[PDB]
Every structure is written in C-alpha cells, then in structure tokens.
Amino acid sequence: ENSSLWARFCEWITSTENRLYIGWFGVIMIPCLLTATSVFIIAFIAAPPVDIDGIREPVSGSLLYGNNIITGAVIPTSNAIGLHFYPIWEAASLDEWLYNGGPYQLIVCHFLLGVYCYMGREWELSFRLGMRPWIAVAYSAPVAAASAVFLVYPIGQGSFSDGMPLGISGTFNFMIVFQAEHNILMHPFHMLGVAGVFGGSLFSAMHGSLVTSSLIRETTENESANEGYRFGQEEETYNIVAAHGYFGRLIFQYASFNNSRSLHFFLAAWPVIGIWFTALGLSTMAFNLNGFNFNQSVVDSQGRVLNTWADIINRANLGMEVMHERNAHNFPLDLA
Amino acid sequence: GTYQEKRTWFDDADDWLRQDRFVFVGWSGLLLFPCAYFALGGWLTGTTFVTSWYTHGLATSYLEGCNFLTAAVSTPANSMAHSLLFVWGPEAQGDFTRWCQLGGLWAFVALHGAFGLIGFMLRQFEIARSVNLRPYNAIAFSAPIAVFVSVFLIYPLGQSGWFFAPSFGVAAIFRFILFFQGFHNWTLNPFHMMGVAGVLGAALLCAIHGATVENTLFEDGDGANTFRAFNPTQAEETYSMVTANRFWSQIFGVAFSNKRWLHFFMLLVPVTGLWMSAIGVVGLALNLRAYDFVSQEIRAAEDPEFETFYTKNILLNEGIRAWMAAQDQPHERLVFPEEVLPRGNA
Amino acid sequence: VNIYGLTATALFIIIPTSFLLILYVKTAST
Amino acid sequence: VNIYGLTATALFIIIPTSFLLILYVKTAST
Amino acid sequence: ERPFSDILTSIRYWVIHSITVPALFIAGWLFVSTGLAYDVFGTPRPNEYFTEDRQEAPLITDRFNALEQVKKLSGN
Amino acid sequence: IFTVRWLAIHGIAVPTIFFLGAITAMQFIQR
Amino acid sequence: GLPWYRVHTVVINDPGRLISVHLMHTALVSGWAGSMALFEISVFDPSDPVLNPMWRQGMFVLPFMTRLGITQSWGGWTISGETATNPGIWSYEGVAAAHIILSGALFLASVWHWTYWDLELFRDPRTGKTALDLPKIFGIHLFLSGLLCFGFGAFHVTGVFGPGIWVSDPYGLTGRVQPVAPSWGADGFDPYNPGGIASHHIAAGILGVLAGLFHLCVRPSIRLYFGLSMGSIETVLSSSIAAVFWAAFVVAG
Amino acid sequence: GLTFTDPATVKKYARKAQLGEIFEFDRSTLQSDGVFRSSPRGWFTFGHVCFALLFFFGHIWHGARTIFRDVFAGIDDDINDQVE
Amino acid sequence: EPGLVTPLGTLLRPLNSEAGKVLPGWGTTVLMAVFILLFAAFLLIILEIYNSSLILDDVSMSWETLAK
Amino acid sequence: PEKLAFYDYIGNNPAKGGLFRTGAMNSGDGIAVGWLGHASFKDQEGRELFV
Amino acid sequence: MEALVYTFLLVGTLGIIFFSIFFRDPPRMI
Amino acid sequence: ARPNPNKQVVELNRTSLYWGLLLIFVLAVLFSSYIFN
Amino acid sequence: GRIPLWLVGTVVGTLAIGLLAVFFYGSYVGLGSSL
Ligand code: CLA
Ligand code: CLA
Ligand code: CLA
Ligand code: CLA
Ligand SMILES: C=Cc1c(C)c2cc3nc(c4c5[nH]c(cc6nc(cc1[nH]2)C(C)=C6CC)c(C)c5C(=O)[C@@H]4C(=O)OC)[C@@H](CCC(=O)OC/C=C(\C)CCC[C@H](C)CCC[C@H](C)CCCC(C)C)[C@@H]3C
Ligand SMILES: CCCCCCCCCCCCCCCC(=O)OC[C@H](CO[C@@H]1O[C@H](CS(=O)(=O)O)[C@@H](O)[C@H](O)[C@H]1O)OC(=O)CCCCCCCCCCCCCCC
Ligand SMILES: CC1=C(/C=C/C(C)=C/C=C/C(C)=C/C=C/C=C(C)/C=C/C=C(C)/C=C/C2=C(C)CCCC2(C)C)C(C)(C)CCC1
Ligand SMILES: CC1=C(/C=C/C(C)=C/C=C/C(C)=C/C=C/C=C(C)/C=C/C=C(C)/C=C/C2=C(C)CCCC2(C)C)C(C)(C)CCC1
Ligand code: OEX
C-alpha cells in the first residue's frame, strides 16, 4: 500500500499471528539467548580446563575430558581477572581466553540480559491480548534469584570465581562453600524461601487434589476423566461449593476460601513473596551480612561453655572453611 | 437398609460421631485427637523444660538459654539404639523424671506422631464419603506420610540407633541435613535430584496457575476490587481458558488446554517428587548410597593434574566427616590430634 | 566402560519408546 | 566377547521388530 | 447460639477471662521461679552441670543399666 | 458448658498461658 | 476408550480370564526362578568355601535352595567339604529344571482358560450372571493354605519325611541341614531358635485349618458385608496388597 | 613370626588394620576396582523395603477405589445438600 | 444364552453357587473382635521380646542362643 | 581358624556398599586367597598399640 | 566412548522439544 | 466360544506421546551417568 | 455487643508486641546471653 518499509516491519514484530510472538523485547531477547545457548553447549562439551582460582591448576569441565553429565560444568572466570570486563577480543589468542575462564562471563552477560527481557515480553504479549499485566511481576521472583547467584554475589565478593558454576556438581560446590562462609541455614531469609517452596508445593498438592476430587460426572469409566472438559467451554467443570464444603469440615469453616478469586491470588502470592526474601537473602549475604551466630552462647556459672546444636553446626562449617580453595589461602583469614 | 433391621448401641454412637459440628470428630477422631494432641504437646514440653545433657551432652531447652532456633526434643543415646523407651519398660522402669533424661521423650513424640498421621489420613476418607466426593485429597497426603515413615522410622531402624534419627527441633534438623552431605553424599543421589524437581516444580505450578487465572479474569463487576465480583454459585467460569492458552502458547510454546488435566498435573508433580525421595532414604538406611563415581576416583588417584568440582566435593565431604564427628558421635569415644584432620593452609 | 552400561541404556530407551509409538499410531488412525 | 557384538544384535532384533508391530497394531484396529 | 462475634463482645466473657487468665499466668511464673521445674523434669541448674567426679559431658554406654547410671552422673 | 468446640480451645488455650508464665520467668534467670 | 493405565481392567468383570492372567503371571515368576538358577550354577565356584564362600560370590537364589536342604549338584560337588555320593533327582540342576517345565505347564493352562473363558461354573444360579461367592472361595484357599503349612512343619522341617532345614553353630564355623525338633515353651519365640520355625508351622497350620472349616460354613453378617464391601472383587485386592507389605517389612527386618 | 620396621611397610599394614583382619587377594582375576560392595543380605533388604513402601501406595489406591466406587467417574450433579 | 458345561464344572458347581446369602443382624462379629484383640496382644509379645523390651528367663536372643 | 578371621573384616559388612556399585563382592576387592596373620604393633619400648 | 553417548541423549531431549512446539496437536475450540 | 463383551480399546494422543518420550529421555539423561560410573 | 472490637485487638495486639520485646530483651541478658 502506501505504508512505509518501517511500518511494514512494525506490523510484523507486534503481529500476534506469529507462532511465537516476538515483540520489541524479543528482538533483543532472541539474539541474546541464541548466543548464550549455542556457546553453553560448546563449553559444556569441548572447553579446555580452566584455571578457576588463579593458582594455575586447571579444572576440567567438559564431557570430552572424562566427565559425565553430573560432573560437567562451565567453569567460572579466574580469580586473577576479578571483575574486569573480559570479552573475547581483549585476550591475545583465543586459547588464552579459554584458559582464563572465557565462556563463563560471555554466557552470564547474555543470559541475564535475556531473562530480564523474557520478563519484558511476558508483559508485552499481555498488553497485545487485553490481559491484565501482572504475570511479568511473578516471573521476577526467579529473575531476582538468578540475578543474585550470577551477578549480585560476585560484586560483593569482588570476583566472578565465587559465582555459581553452570553445572550440576558445580552447583553443589557453590552451596557448600556458601554456607561454610555465610551460614545460610541460620538466616531468616533462607528460612522464608524454604517455607516459600514447602508452602508452595503444599498449596499445589492441596488445590490440585480438590479440583480433581469435585469433577462432574460426564464420561464413562473406561474413558479417562479428562474427556469431560471440552476446550473453550463456558460452564464450570467442577463443583466449587462442594470443595469449600469439604475443606470447611476438614479443619474449620473459617480456614477456607469460598471466593475462588481470592484463592488463586493466595496461590500466586505465597511462593512469589517467599522467593523474594531468599533472593534478597544472598543479596545481603553478598555484602557480608552472614546470618545468625550462636557459637559459645549458652554458658553457665564458673565460666564454662555448654554445647548446643549451634555449636555442632559450627563444627560442620569449621570443617568446610579450612577445606575450600585448598591451595589459595596464605593468610589466616578468608577476607576474599 | 430397605428391610427394617433394628438399631444397636454402635449405630446410635455413629450418629453422634458423624454429626455436623464446628469441628468434625467422626470415627477417626478417636485415633487422631488424643494422638495428635500429645505429639505437639509433648514437643512443647520437651523443647521448653527437658534437657539433652545426658543423651548428647548439649543443652536444648528454653530453661537453659536455647532460643527458638536452638531448642530441640533430642533423640535418645546410642546405648538403647532400638528400644521403644516405654515409660514402664526396662530402660525407664516407671520413673518419669529419669525417663525424660534418657531422651525417651523423643520416642513419645515420634510414635504418637505416627498414629496421628494415620488418623489424619483416615479423617480425609470419612469426610469425603460423607460429602460423596472423590478421595484424591487422601491420596496426596500419603506422600507426606512416606517422607515421615522413611526418614524418621525406617532410617533409624536400618542404622545403628535411634540416635541418628532427626531431633524434633529447628537447628537439630540442620545437622541432620549436614550429616547427610558428608557421611552420605546425599546431593548426588538421583532420588533426591528427583525430589528437588518435585518440590521446585510444584512451587512453579503454584505461581503460574495462581497468576494466569488472576490475569485472565472476566470483567464482571465495576469496582476495581476484582475480588468482589464472584458469586460462588455461578454457572460460568471466572477466567478465560482460551486466552490463557494463547498467552503461554506464544510465550512458552506449549500450554494447557484442559482444566481437568491441569489441576491433576498440579497433583502429580509434588506427590511423585516426595515418593521418589522416600526411596533414596531407604538406600541410606542400608548405606547403599551413591557416594562415588569409580572412573573418576581412579583417574584422580594417578594424576595430580586432573580435577573437577566432583573431586572438589569429595574433599569437602572429608572436611565434614573428620571434623564434626568428634562431637556428633560421642558414643564412639574418639579423639583426634590436630594433625590427623585434613586442612589446606593458613 | 561398563560393557553392559550402554546396552542397559539402549534397551531402556528403545523398549518404552516402541511401547508408546504402538499406542499412538493406532490412535491417530481413528 | 565383542562388546559391540551383543548390542549390534540387540538393535538388529528390536528395531525391525518394533517396526512391524506398529504396522500390525494399526491394522488389526480397523 | 454464640456465632463467635458476641463472645468477644460480652461483658460476662471479660469477667471470667480477667481472673482465671492471670491466675493461670502467675502459676506459670511460680513453676520455674521456685526451682520446681528443675526437679520435676530433671534439667540441671547452671551451678549443677559439672560435678567433682566428672568434668566433661555425660555418657551412658549401657542399655539396661542406664537408670542407676544416670543417677550417678547426676551427682545424686 | 462442655462442648466439643470449647474443649478444643481450652485443651490448647489453658496450657499455653501456663507456659508463657514459664518462659517469661526464664528470661530473668541470671547465670 | 481406555487410557494406558486402565488396560488391565477388562479382566475385572468376567472370572474366567482372570484365571488365565493369574496363570500367566505364575508362569513368569517360576520361569524367572528356573532361569535364575541355571544362570547362577553355570557361574558358581565351589572351590574355596572357607574363604571365597557362597555369599561373597554375590548370589541370590542359590542360598534359598540351600536353606531348605539342597546341597549337591549334578556336577558332583557339595558345599560343606565333600563330593556327591549320588545327587538324586532333586539337585541344583534338577530343581532348576523343575520350575521351567512347571512354567511351560502353567503357560498352556493360561491359554486354555483364555479361550474357554465362558463356563457355567461362573454364571451363578437364580441370576444367571457372572458372580463369585467371595467368602466361601476364601475358605477353600485358607484351608489349603494351612494344610501346606501343617505339612511343611510336620514333615519337611521335623525330618519325618523331608530333610530338615539349615542349622549353624553360633559363629558360622560349621553347620548343615539336619532335622530339628520343635520347641514349645517361651524359647519357641526366640527368633534365633530354629526349633521355633517347626513349632510355628505346626501351630499355625492347625489354626488355619480350623479357620478354613469356619469360613466354609459360616456366612458373613449383613452389617459386616456392606462395611467391608464383600460383594466386590477389589476389596480382597486392596487387602491382599495390605497383607503382603506387612509380610515384606517382617521379611526384610 | 616376622617383623618389619620399614617406614613404608608399617603404614601399609596399619592402614589395612582398620579393616579388621589382614588378607591377600588377587585383583586381576575379576579385574577388581578396589572399593567394596554389599552382601546379598544387603541387596535383599533394599528390594523388599522399596517394594513394600511402594505397595503401601497400592493399598491406598485400591482401598480408596472400593469405598468410592460409585463416584469414580466424577461426582453427580446436585450434592449441594451438605451446606450446613 | 447358556455357558459351557464341563465335567469338572458340574462338580465344583455347588461351591460357587450361593453368591449373596448373608446372615441378618450382627452375626459372629463380636466373636471376631475377640480374636483380633488377642492376636494384637500376641504381636506385642513377639515384638517386645525381639526388641528386648521384655526379658524372659529362657530366651537370651543372640547368636549364642541358636547354638544351644 | 582361618574362617573366623575372615568373618571379622569390614569388607564383608553389607553396609560398606554403594548403590550403583554393581556385581559381586569378589568383584570389589578380589577373590580372597589366604589369611595373612594377626599384626601386632609394638612401640620402641615394646608397648603394644591398638588400632 | 561415553562422551558421544551422553551427547546423543542431550540432543535427543532437544529433539522432542522441537517437535513438541511446532508439531504439537493443535487445540481446537468447542 | 462366545465373543467376550469386555473388549475395550486403548488410545494415546499426541500430547501424551510427548510426555512419554520426554519422560524416558530425561531420566535416561539422569541415570546413565551412574550406570557407566 | 458491649465493648467495640477495635480497641480489643489494639490492647491485645499491643500486649502481644509488648510480649515479644521481652524475648528479644531476654536474648541479650540472662541465660544464653553469651557473656
Ligand atoms: C488411642 C490412642 C492412643 C494410641 C494409639 C496410643 C499409642 C501408644 N502410646 Mg499413648 N496414650 C494415650 C492414647 C494412645 N496411645 C492416652 C490417652 C494417654 C494418656 C493416658 C497416653 C499416654 C501414653 C504414655 C505415657 C505412653 C504411651 C505410649 C504409647 C505406645 C505404646 C503402646 C502400648 O504399649 O500399649 C499397649 C496396650 C495396647 C496396645 C492395648 C491393647 C488392648 C489389649 C490387647 C486388650 C486386652 C486387655 C486385657 C484385659 C488384658 C488382660 C491382662 C490380664 C492377664 C492381666 C503407643 C505408640 C508409650 C510410648 O509412647 O512409648 C514410648 C508411653 O510411654 N501413651
Ligand atoms: C497385586 C498387585 C496389583 C494388582 C493386581 C493391581 C491391579 C490393578 N491396578 Mg493397581 N497398583 C498396585 C498393585 C496392583 N494393582 C500398586 C502396588 C500400585 C502402586 C504403584 C498401584 C497403583 C495403581 C494405579 C494408580 C492404578 C492401578 C490400576 C490398576 C488396574 C489396572 C492396571 C493397569 O492397567 O496397569 C497397566 C500397566 C501397564 C500398561 C504397564 C505399567 C508399567 C509398569 C509401571 C512398569 C513395568 C512393570 C514392571 C517391570 C514389572 C515388575 C513388577 C514388580 C512387582 C517387580 C488393576 C485393577 C489402575 C486402576 O485401578 O484404574 C482403573 C490405576 O489407575 N494401580
Ligand atoms: C506354638 C506356638 C507358636 C510358636 C512357637 C510360634 C513361633 C513363631 N511365630 Mg507364630 N503363630 C502361631 C503359633 C506359634 N508361632 C499361631 C497360632 C499364629 C496365628 C496363626 C501365629 C502367627 C504368627 C505370625 C503372624 C507371626 C508369627 C511369628 C513367629 C516367630 C516369632 C517372632 C519372630 O521371629 O520375631 C520376628 C517377627 C516380628 C517381631 C513381627 C514384627 C511385626 C511388626 C510389628 C510388623 C511391622 C510392619 C508395620 C506395618 C511397620 C512398617 C512401618 C515401619 C517400618 C515404620 C516364631 C517363628 C512371626 C514371624 O513370622 O516370625 C518371623 C510373625 O510375624 N507367628
Ligand atoms: C511345586 C511346589 C514347589 C516347590 C517344592 C518349590 C520349591 C522351591 N522354590 Mg519354587 N515355585 C513354585 C513351586 C514350588 N517351588 C511355583 C508354583 C512358583 C510360581 C509362583 C514358584 C516360584 C519360585 C520362585 C520365584 C522362587 C522359588 C524358590 C524355591 C525354593 C525355596 C522356596 C522358599 O524358600 O520359599 C519360601 C516361601 C515363603 C517364605 C512363603 C511363606 C508364605 C507367605 C508368608 C505367605 C503366607 C500367606 C498365607 C495366606 C498364609 C495364611 C495361612 C495361615 C494363617 C494358616 C525351593 C527350591 C526360590 C528359589 O530358591 O529360587 C529357585 C525362588 O526364588 N520358587
Ligand atoms: C515441612 C513441610 C510441611 C509441613 C509442616 C506440612 C504441614 C501440613 N500439611 C498438612 C496437610 C497437607 N500437606 C500436603 C502435602 C504436602 N505437605 C508438604 C510439606 C509439609 N506439610 C509437602 C512437601 C507436600 C507435597 C506432597 C497435603 C496434600 C496435605 C493435606 O491435605 C493436609 C491438610 O489438610 O492441611 C491443612 C497439615 C497436616 C495436618 C496434620 O496432620 O496435623 C495433625 C498433627 C499431627 C498428626 C501430628 C504430626 C506430628 C509430626 C509428624 C511429628 C511432631 C513434630 C513436631 C510437632 C514439630 C517439630 C517441628 C521441628 C521440625 C521444628 C499441615 C498444615
Ligand atoms: C535440533 C534437532 C536435533 C535432532 C532431532 C532428532 C529428533 C529425534 C526425536 C524425534 C521425535 C519424534 C516424535 C514423534 C513426532 C510426531 O509424532 O510428529 C507427528 C507429525 C504430525 O504432524 C501433522 O502433519 C499434518 C500434515 S500432513 O498430513 O503430514 O501433510 C497435519 O495435518 C497435522 O496437523 C500435523 O500435526 O508427523 C509429521 O507430519 C512429520 C513426521 C514426523 C515423524 C518423523 C520423526 C522422526 C524423524 C526425525 C528426524 C530424524 C531423527 C533420526 C531418528 C528418528
Ligand atoms: C508430655 C506429657 C504429656 C502431655 C502434656 C501436654 C499435652 C502438654 C501440652 C502443652 C501445650 C499445649 C503447650 C502449648 C504451648 C504453647 C506455647 C508455649 C506457645 C508459644 C508461642 C509463642 C512464644 C509465640 C507466640 C506468638 C506467635 C505465634 C507469633 C506472633 C507473636 C505471638 C506472641 C502471638 C502427657 C499428659 C500426655 C503425659 C505426661 C507428660
Ligand atoms: C526392569 C527390571 C526389573 C524387572 C525385571 C523382571 C520383571 C524380570 C523378569 C524376568 C522373567 C520373568 C523371565 C522369565 C523367563 C521365563 C522363561 C525363560 C520361561 C521359559 C519357558 C519355557 C521355555 C517353556 C517351554 C515349554 C512349553 C512352552 C511347552 C511345555 C514344555 C516346555 C517346557 C518345552 C526390576 C524392576 C525388578 C529391577 C531390575 C530391572
Ligand atoms: O573464591 Mn570461591 O571462597 Ca570468597 O573466601 Mn577466600 O575467596 Mn574463595 O576462599 Mn573462601
């Protein structure tokens, strides 16, 4: 028509008729995730071993170097680099990039930029369909959690080596070293997040049971119960008064939601608020505000010290403090 | 029925038991209510007044200075190791104030908790049959029972004592968790790796379905407080399953299309997770743990250049075992020179 | 290598794979 | 033993076995 | 009767739960402040953990013989 | 008044006010 | 049509196919044990029993044959330190071939009851439809359960007709299969007493017979009928699954 | 009736002395890896607890199917009688 | 329609014949509850023996007991 | 006896196992060939020590 | 050897994820 | 003899094929790390 | 009813948050005070 080249282009990005919606976050999400995906696969398979700690003992992380799926990892950037922006072109040779912890910092910068914008297009499509916009808020609870383990925690420590590796056994070392230095289990933000998922799983097992247990009889018994629902129907597929009536007898009548719109808000609000504190937990633990510490706290008269369980957890932490980075510490404090 | 049989005393008792009330008693209430009440009441008594100085050798009460985090109803000592510690039995012999001192108030709570959990699951059966529903709420609660029975009962009945059970306290769990990392390497048991995916996967279905419903609602009121516009007896649904399909179909790629299958999928993901983690504790009760990979312990034995994070984790498990087990297992009477424990430097 | 490692995996993949294919192909021909 | 001996046989048996079963089961459901 | 709103508004409620409530609280104060709680349950006082015989944490190591043994470790 | 609902409250509400007398007096115990 | 997990409930209506399936599952369980025995005796090492014993070799079904009195192979070796005078027909190889010919027998019986599923034995009178007298059918199996339990104790353990069971010394240094005599006092409940085993099967064998004649003769109450839902084929299934893990915790412990 | 005072040999047998008694083996006959395993007493116990604890779920599901047989296909239309 | 009639089917026919007949009232149910409460007490014998929670004079419950 | 010194050996304990360590116990640490005799650990002053 | 067996099973999972998006069973309204 | 009136049919739609094949491959990614040790 | 509910919850809710401050006060002094 009389439309420009640009208007032809903007009526394609914001077109909802596409199989996967792009939108304007997706024009910079899609080339960042396909960057970060395609480099994650290669370094998980063919990365040469990385000096993680700067002491020139390279750690293996590739499947081609005698690892399996569980011990495979993408090894973090070396301790000598620290927080210096280390792209591919600052290295002289390409193998100097790989040995120093190259593809960790390439992935994380494209990953975190990708998931900030995957949250963006969850808003953007919801504006293109007339939906209410707050699904993008609920995706910020993992985005707050993933920003902390990759970016907010290496800032407070000063190096990308202390961030979390991209591996299954790589994660498990990061959980151990963290609690040895910061005692995460004795921090009320990790206590909220633990209740965020034990409550979150309970509120899914309980809600999903009662909707299944109040289904209306529409099929036979040889046919599955999922055939009673036909897609896009108007009438309700389960009795709601019967499930409040059941759950009202179960504990007491005031302990239930009869308003199903107030119910589904509670299912959204409980884990999302819970993950927000355990995302802010290690965000504050990144700036060295560890947790509780009740060592040598219960004492009697005559100046003696009684053990508690907190002194037992001390012995676990003290056994891991003196073992992580085994050839690094030249000095009797772990300030770094 | 329909032939005029007479009424007996048992029939008369049933009407009082299955009478509608502010709290439902039923027949299962005779098993539930005196067994559940003594469990938590036996927990609050032990965490407040009852020591642990003779069993483990460490204070555990509010009457000793331990706060809410560090108070625990502690397990018995490893001397008994499998006794039920009856208050009349030979380890106690009637004396109550010496019965608590041997840690026997642990077994008062664990055993009265088990018959509580049977009774509470039976509670969900007779309420469902009264209202004539389907039993799926009862079937989901078996997965908390399988976690309870395997961890607190099958695991000490496989290990060397009730001593190695968890104690009913906050920080006392925190060593039991840290017990399983060093001594078992429990994070590499795939039965726990399928437990985590059940827990974190069900936390994700609680957050999406609660937000997809809340953002695809139908405009039925005029006040912007959209909770006001729900008559719960209405025949139509309150949100748009068509629109919610097309959102995640273009955001994520594949979405639900079946409201019956969806809530059942929210049933299946947490229940399979715990049931596939009750199997892993059974292997730990026999110490059939997935501690090692053979083909990397060999390669790290002959070469001081090869390592992974796996071999860095085996050293950290040695740091938990060789350090805390001096105080954690006092029945083993073992002492350590400060040269026999592994360290790094400085 | 476990000699029975790759062939306990191969039977674990192919036999329930071929189980689900049989039920699906008779379904889609209805 | 040829390590690949028993697993080249096993794939030779199970994959054309499962091929013919799929065509037969959709046939007999007609 | 009693839909739970009228209970927490009536004055016959607050003429009963203003007398039995502190009398249950003060009796809870006396149970520990008089030293009764240390002996009815058996937790040691702060001047009672270590006796003159032992100077470390107690330890049983005998199943059927624990009742008389703990009475030695208690210092009694 | 001996109601099933009343017993459920006073089976819990009576021992919890007895215990709050204990812990508050535990806070004023010196070393 | 069905889902994939309700496919075996076509059997729940008619009685006749349910025998045919329960024969097929019985043919597999035996045919495992015949296959597991022949596999293992072909990889057994009878050389050094004092120091490379039977248990260390890593072995599953052959101690369960040895415990009830099978100590000789057709190869001519024994366990305890001698060779075979004559193995007899019931040896390691013969018991292994006993289950497989049993398995091919029970395979064929499944094929018969699958084809001739419709029998007048099953269609009861005064309705003319498929039913099962579920209490009376229990008395017929409970009678024959204790009758095999009585016969095992009086004969196979006592040594009147069978060989006995394995009995060791306290420290494993010796021991073999001799007949034992039952112990009836409080020692019969010592689990390390072998005499309690023969005492158990004679005592529990009699009571199952007396319970077997009870449940044949006494019809259940109408109040207890509708409570435990006697008229359905699945109330026995949920209870037989309930009984068998009570067994499996005791057996594992 | 031998003696050793060798600084390598004493450690080489004191490490073996933790394991109970001292032995000689042949790790070339079966190509042994050097790390232990579990006796069939241990394997039989594992199977018949995992089976048993799984059969506990089977008892519930078929126990719940017999009692709730009438409403297996989903509940009926009107069950709104139960409102107090 | 009729079923199929076999020689062994007519023989076992009166065994699977009276499907449905029950006793009115309560029957032998109170007599059944006697045997359950005994058998539950019987298990508390052999458990608290085998837990060594009750000690008898002729058992000692070790491997030594098995060897006379 | 040689047998009673064989039952007293932690490599025969089934709790010293692994979940994915397949096969025989003899595949773990070889077929036992012979007993090597009771070690006794003497001090420089001849005082016997215990492991 | 197993380093190529692992990469088969990784890209095998990514195979279904391609087929589960674009070749899905299309949901039909009403 | 007579045709059995209990003949039922089994079906597995495409959205259930994808949960099946993705179930099998994922735990085959899981456990194959342990089978080879 | 007689007494308005809103100053019932204020008086109780003050005496609950007044009660919590003692347990924080008792955390730095007395037993378990680490001194
Ligand atoms: C119904 C609820 C219920 C249940 C299931 C249990 C269950 C249990 N309790 Mg708890 N308890 C309860 C109510 C309950 N209790 C109440 C209400 C109280 C307050 C008084 C207690 C107080 C309490 C204490 C203080 C203790 C227990 C203990 C126990 C355990 C031991 C069981 C035992 O030895 O009983 C054995 C008895 C039976 C199983 C009854 C069987 C019925 C018999 C066979 C009928 C025959 C009677 C006949 C007349 C006998 C004739 C004898 C003649 C020859 C002289 C068990 C877990 C102990 C424990 O926890 O272990 C550490 C313990 O120390 N309970
Ligand atoms: C004595 C045992 C027994 C028997 C006879 C039955 C019989 C039945 N069950 Mg039940 N069930 C049992 C144990 C048993 N169950 C246990 C222990 C569990 C807990 C896991 C269940 C859980 C269960 C559920 C959740 C359901 C049934 C259903 C059914 C019905 C059809 C089964 C079907 O279509 O499966 C078809 C099976 C397949 C197509 C293959 C399954 C493949 C399995 C999972 C793995 C491969 C088998 C394995 C290698 C063999 C090893 C056996 C093991 C014992 C060693 C039928 C009435 C269904 C029902 O009642 O709906 C009407 C149903 O939905 N059962
Ligand atoms: C002359 C009489 C006589 C004698 C000497 C015996 C002798 C014996 N009987 Mg027999 N018995 C007899 C008559 C006799 N019986 C009669 C008349 C009956 C009635 C038919 C029985 C019924 C019977 C049964 C049902 C059992 C015995 C058992 C035993 C053995 C003693 C207990 C034992 O070994 O401890 C070991 C066994 C136990 C301590 C039983 C533990 C039961 C626990 C509570 C089950 C736990 C499951 C539960 C669900 C918990 C799981 C969850 C948990 C992990 C958290 C011994 C061989 C037991 C046996 O089989 O021996 C192995 C047994 O279970 N007897
Ligand atoms: C013809 C009879 C016969 C005989 C003599 C044998 C003999 C043998 N079999 Mg074979 N077997 C047979 C039939 C037979 N089998 C059949 C028909 C099957 C198919 C199901 C099998 C399947 C089979 C397997 C799978 C295995 C054997 C094994 C064995 C060996 C040891 C059996 C053992 O210790 O079990 C001990 C039996 C028990 C502990 C069961 C006790 C009964 C329980 C507790 C159930 C009680 C419930 C009941 C209702 C009781 C209530 C009544 C009471 C109240 C009165 C032995 C060589 C084992 C072996 O060594 O491999 C070769 C083995 O693994 N057999
Ligand atoms: C730690 C996590 C956790 C807790 C605290 C918890 C708690 C609860 N869940 C319940 C229900 C459920 N939860 C379910 C699935 C799940 N539940 C999960 C995890 C949990 N569930 C998970 C992960 C799932 C997913 C499978 C379902 C499906 C239900 C219900 O339907 C049920 C309900 O209706 O909720 C309202 C309630 C049980 C009522 C009851 O038996 O009281 C009676 C009390 C008894 C029987 C005494 C128990 C005694 C215990 C076992 C031992 C004593 C422990 C001490 C008292 C406390 C020790 C505390 C220390 C650890 C600090 C209760 C609110
Ligand atoms: C990154 C990639 C890495 C490598 C990938 C390896 C993948 C391996 C796993 C493949 C999983 C296949 C599962 C089943 C797929 C399915 O059911 O599709 C069903 C669709 C139905 O689409 C239908 O098509 C119809 C049109 S028409 O009739 O077909 O013309 C239409 O009517 C209907 O709406 C539409 O649904 O069938 C097709 O149209 C395409 C054929 C699919 C069958 C071939 C798949 C196998 C070959 C894959 C490539 C080689 C891999 C080597 C190993 C085989
Ligand atoms: C052992 C025993 C027994 C029992 C007893 C009992 C049962 C008791 C009970 C008890 C109880 C029953 C108790 C209770 C308690 C409670 C408490 C102690 C509480 C506390 C709390 C707190 C401290 C907190 C609070 C709060 C919260 C929650 C939060 C917010 C704030 C407030 C403050 C509000 C018997 C007899 C069997 C036998 C003998 C001995
Ligand atoms: C997966 C798995 C499993 C399972 C397994 C199984 C299940 C197995 C089985 C196996 C089996 C189950 C086998 C069987 C076999 C059989 C056989 C091998 C048989 C044979 C027979 C025959 C050959 C016969 C013949 C004949 C006939 C037919 C006619 C008559 C005569 C005669 C004899 C000739 C489990 C989980 C446990 C674990 C491991 C893995
Ligand atoms: O980097 Mn990973 O962990 Ca933060 O402390 Mn020092 O440095 Mn290292 O050690 Mn401790």
Ligand SMILES: [Fe+2]
């Ligand atoms: Fe919902």
